[PDB]
Design goal:
78 residues; Ubiquitin-like (UB roll); 2 helices; alpha+beta; apoptosis; homodimer; four-stranded mixed sheet; 23% helix; Lipid transferase CIDEC (chain B)
């Protein structure tokens, strides 16, 4: 049961969220970050690498900054 | 090679799609990347996204940092500067 640091796409709000899995993370992120709708994609905040498997989500360091993307939203350089 | 798979960040040559892929070796990685990145055909070369350094041995692939961004090149594609 693990600690994730998660940003919105405009990087204005970053929050620490505990998750058992990628899917659990994705189920929590809307309420926590007060997203306008459900997330479409989870990406690495540093470079926009798409996190789309559980095994890859779990191999990343606990201090990894994640970014949620809603439909049509794209990762952008900080 | 590595009993436990290692996380790789992998870019297409146009840098529009970037994805985290788990891999046990260079060969395993190269076996996986076409379906994952939706490549039109099999990869020809794996390169460092940063400077186009060719990754062509398993030992060099394994020595790289986990956050290294890779780039796949298909036949006749060339690394280009970002």
């Amino acid at each position: 049961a693990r600690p994730c640091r998660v940003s919105t796409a405009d990087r204005k709000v970053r929050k620490g969220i505990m998750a058992h899995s990628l899917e659990d993370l994705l189920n929590k992120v809307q309420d926590i970050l007060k997203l306008k709708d459900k997330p479409f994609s989870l990406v690495l905040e540093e470079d926009g690498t798409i996190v789309e498997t559980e095994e890859y989500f779990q191999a990343l360091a606990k201090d990894t900054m994640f970014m949620v993307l809603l439909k049509g939203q794209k990762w952008k350089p900080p």
